[PDB]
Amino acid sequence: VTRIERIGAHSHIRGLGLDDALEPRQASQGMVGQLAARRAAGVVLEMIREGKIAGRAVLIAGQPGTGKTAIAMGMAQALGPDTPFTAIAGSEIFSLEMSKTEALTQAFRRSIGVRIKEETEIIEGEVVEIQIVGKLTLKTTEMETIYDLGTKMIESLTKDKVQAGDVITIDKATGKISKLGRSFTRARDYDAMGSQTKFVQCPDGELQKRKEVVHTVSLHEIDVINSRTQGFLALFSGDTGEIKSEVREQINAKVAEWREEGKAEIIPGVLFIDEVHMLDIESFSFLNRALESDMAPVLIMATNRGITRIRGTSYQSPHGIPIDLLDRLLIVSTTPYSEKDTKQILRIRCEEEDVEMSEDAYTVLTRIGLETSLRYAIQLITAASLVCRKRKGTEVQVDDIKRVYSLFLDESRSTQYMKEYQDAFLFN
Amino acid sequence: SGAVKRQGRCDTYATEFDLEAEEYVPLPKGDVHKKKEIIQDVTLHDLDVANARPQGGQDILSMMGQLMKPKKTEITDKLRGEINKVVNKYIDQGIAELVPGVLFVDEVHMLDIECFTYLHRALESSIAPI
Amino acid sequence: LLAGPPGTGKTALALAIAQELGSKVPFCPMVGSEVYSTEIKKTEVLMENFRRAIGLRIKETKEVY
Amino acid sequence: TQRIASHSHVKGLGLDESGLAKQAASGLVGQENAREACGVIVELIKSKKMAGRAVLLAGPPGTGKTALALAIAQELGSKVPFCPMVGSEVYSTEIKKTEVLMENFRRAIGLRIKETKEVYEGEVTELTPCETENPKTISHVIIGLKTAKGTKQLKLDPSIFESLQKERVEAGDVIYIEANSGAVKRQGRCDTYATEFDLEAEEYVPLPKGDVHKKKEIIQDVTLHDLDVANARPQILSMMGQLMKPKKTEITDKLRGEINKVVNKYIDQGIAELVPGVLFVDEVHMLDIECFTYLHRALESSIAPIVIFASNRGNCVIRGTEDITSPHGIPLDLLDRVMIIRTMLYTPQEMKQIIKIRAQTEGINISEEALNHLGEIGTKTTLRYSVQLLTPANLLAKINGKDSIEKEHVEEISELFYDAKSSAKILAD
Amino acid sequence: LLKERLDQIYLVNERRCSQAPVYGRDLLRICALPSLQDVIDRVAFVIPPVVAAPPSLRVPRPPPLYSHRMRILRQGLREHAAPYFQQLRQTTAPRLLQFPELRLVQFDSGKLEALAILLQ
Amino acid sequence: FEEWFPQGRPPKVPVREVCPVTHRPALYRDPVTDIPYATARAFKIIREAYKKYITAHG
Amino acid sequence: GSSYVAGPLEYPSASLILKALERDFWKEADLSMFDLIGLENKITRHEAELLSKKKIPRKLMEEISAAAKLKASRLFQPVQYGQKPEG
């Protein structure tokens, strides 16, 4: 069945494909070649797991199509889902709802997980009888007890309309009541039931249990909840506005106190900013100080620009990044693929896309990929598969690749044909 | 769900008074108990906007939310992830079917560099449409 | 990318694709200039349109008294 | 605290009693003249006499300007409010840039409030009224209060009878009565009467320890910006305000003057003491001409904090102007209002010392030859780069089962990771 | 047919128990951190030049669903307003009227001024 | 006057009940026999004893 | 001095305009299964785990389809000091 997640441009990548010694293996976990870059990404992944050093920034720089996003996806897959990995595009910070610096601050604070432990003492049981002073009788499969009721407790029992046969949980630390459901029985069957009705077994064990619960949140979530009375709604709508510095400082101090008390753990994650050259000089200047914090995540960036104009200025700089921010980061360089690496990437894409191809088809498609681009050949994989299926074949041949090559153009051929008829196109 | 809807007064009582401000609807024709297998098509965006802001709440803040100026909002990646998870669960249960479709962007030359640069990640996603 | 001079059937071909797919398969048309919302950022507009193009047929038996 | 940041080793200006800078102390190496000038700035801050004095840290990238500002912050302690800002933060979407600047100015003025409360707390043991003939008439209401230390009887004014019944005080309740107002507050049944069989939560409290009568001192630290925000929007109008988004507002000068008046009244009354502090503006060249001009007026206020600017831009065009180049990106008019501290490039030896101190703070064992190699890497490339190599080389060493970095680990990490200049070289080719 | 009823009950119950909240109550609870009036009334005098009730949308045959929804909306709003109604009334009612201050009844004539002096 | 100033006798200190089965601080009381207990095993033993005693008595 | 007061601007329209967007209930599914935010005021993650754990299986549904104030001394003998209670 078609699940939400389908075959995308990086579905085949399931990790960096490294060993215990971080030595890059050829054709492992979907990654091919890029040995030096994969080794550097493995070192960065070890830094991320260790967590000790905040605000380490790495720039993955290379030519288009050289697997920068591939390496980012491999790092995200190799890193456990427990550790945050906030992936955004450079253009995601230009919002009407918040400044660029606020959007960067929220992106940073999404990338630090905080894991808060809590112990509670609750009484959970099935209601046997309630008498309005007042008395309440609760039971489990192993016990039955009767309690005396205070004013607020009887008020809560009345207001929630706790009726005999319900399963309720009352927290002694706060005296609040929660109805988990009503126990099914022969007399309680109905021809229609309300939406809130939920049938549940009688609780097991002892009535007054001691709980241990661990909540995993993030610093941005703590920020937003403390932004306003109903702030947690903004965790859905995103209408957070600009959160005040008081709230962030108070939360930083509270999380420090919690970690000192042993209540919370801090799990620093990763903020990947693909296409980072969309940031402007103001965003880069904010980042220059944002990375000097102890609550900064490990920052990973990717770009393909050369010596280009920094956005927001008239100056030209490598990777479109000012040299102030480049001095704060390490650079991992990708290398263009060989014939073997191109063919093996094509093979892995055929295996994921479930396409059977003849060896001559592999040769011709690899030549096409070397001559035009890797992405064009990957696209032609499924294109030729569809054309082969329309032919009632079971294996993609060279004629099918010739067919889809004749149907779908690349940048070079499309540009040439556009130039041939350039009188008809607008605003050359 | 136990939802009850009073869809008017029975037309047999249309002569119980000569002048009442009531809506008379005919007596149902079929059986009292009706079963129908049905389908509804929704988009993931519909689920996103449904969970973007609480609706149908009887609390005063929800009633004011019904009253207020409707605005588009920058729905978070976390809500989209949670909706994806729920849709996946119900696809596994068998009561929902994904139907991926097509997004057509005519006169795409009008996008700025920022839109194209975002479309790089947007197209590379495994949830994106054609 | 459907490319070529004005009046060469690009939009007609896209609508023909829509016709061939059918009504059940979603087909969200948008123009590039519709990203300049005064309420939400351009990438949010694009993400909304990406999500609209994925449909979900939900199947149920209604029982009513 | 526990995680290690780029400045986590800066523990203060390494100055002696005479104000001279030690060659390497308190985590700082070199920059002796700049550190001595920063020390004079610290004396200026601690004098609390002056307002709006400005100092510009100026010098090449990676010359410790931010390290020197955070060293001033360490020297001043946690009592003095130190407000970090970067110039990119003024460009908010909720409020105008000059409001952001004024808000950060008021964040750097601290106020310390001292409250002294007298309270009579205990478990209620008797509530007998004292009947009398009027010159039933009562002249006193006797309350007996019990704590773990002992018991006291109080001869309260009869008018307190209204508050006792309003609070529904009975025998066995813990209460407290403040000396000034004489109003009673009830805080629950004493837990000595709680059983495990009855269910209530908020209505029980432990029997108070200590003497029945207590004198409490409450000290709170606030900023003038905190008072501004509190008086600008106090917390059905509240329902709509909490449902709607609480945006930043352009607080008027009227409110700031009123709060200045109230704080001066508190300082006269002895309840409060002012702690004026420091606003640090890094990347100040990101401010535009409107901000710099506003800062002209802002620094001339008698209420302003001491502000520390940092820039590295050299002769650069001022943002928001056209073709107006300036010696630091900072217009000459504003530069006439700041004292400038220059920061200078490091020698290879100073760089090696910094690298060693970083390795120490990161908890990294580095061999002598590895240290020499990394120093010479840092005399090429940059200091920042060579420092950044420490932890990945430590990890590579841990993989190879070595407890200390060897030169081969530095070489391999250098071959894996490249700097800004080598990458510019690759881009050019 | 009780088998079909049990199947329906089980399916609905399994659907209802399956889903956990994204955040939950305990998470939010644990993540939570711990004079001119006299001068105002002397200056409040501007009356609007025009007042009008809100436009009323007129339809023949108003839909039963639309009317029922509006009725329940009004009922809920008025039920929630009742504990705070005088506050809503005073914090929303507009200033429509402007009488001349009684101080002018003296001011208009010098006889009344001298009479004020003499009577005082 | 007596309404506004009731002379309330101070509340009695509660009995710190103990479980008759294990002699632990009492946490519960059985609704049927009104005997406090501290564990599920105590509850089972108490109910077995109660059924035996009600059989012997009548 | 007093304001002018205008009568309201009555705005005529057809009934159908308000009936728009009203779909028959035979084409509306129980989309509440996808409702996320509505659960925040209803249940809790630990409560969700309890509900998932203690949901009644079908077989139990198919199967579905004396107080007196005594005293501890009356039932149980006291225990001698220095001895483990046994009951």
Ligand SMILES: Nc1ncnc2c1ncn2[C@@H]1O[C@H](COP(=O)(O)OP(=O)(O)OP(O)(O)=S)[C@@H](O)[C@H]1O
């Ligand atoms: N080493 C590799 N192993 C497996 N798949 C790869 C590899 N390198 C590239 N690919 C795939 O080939 C395509 C390369 O595109 P990207 O990974 O986006 O390259 P890129 O470096 O990010 O180029 P830009 O900057 O985004 S234009 C994707 O479909 C990748 O999944």
Ligand SMILES: Nc1ncnc2c1ncn2[C@@H]1O[C@H](COP(=O)(O)OP(=O)(O)OP(O)(O)=S)[C@@H](O)[C@H]1O
């Ligand atoms: N092959 C075709 N068969 C029938 N009608 C066509 C064909 N190609 C174009 N048309 C019609 O002729 C007109 C051409 O307009 P479009 O199809 O929109 O061309 P176009 O390339 O989209 O022009 P632009 O770039 O949007 S201005 C439309 O009214 C089409 O319906």
Ligand SMILES: Nc1ncnc2c1ncn2[C@@H]1O[C@H](COP(=O)(O)OP(=O)(O)OP(O)(O)=S)[C@@H](O)[C@H]1O
């Ligand atoms: N004298 C010093 N002693 C010890 N550590 C230093 C010294 N100077 C700089 N550092 C450290 O080396 C790094 C570079 O110094 P910074 O304060 O970041 O330089 P900077 O002047 O702020 O550069 P710019 O202008 O912001 S790009 C930081 O991690 C400092 O903590």
Ligand SMILES: [Mg+2]
């Ligand atoms: Mg990419």
Ligand SMILES: [Mg+2]
């Ligand atoms: Mg067209």
Ligand SMILES: [Mg+2]
């Ligand atoms: Mg700096």
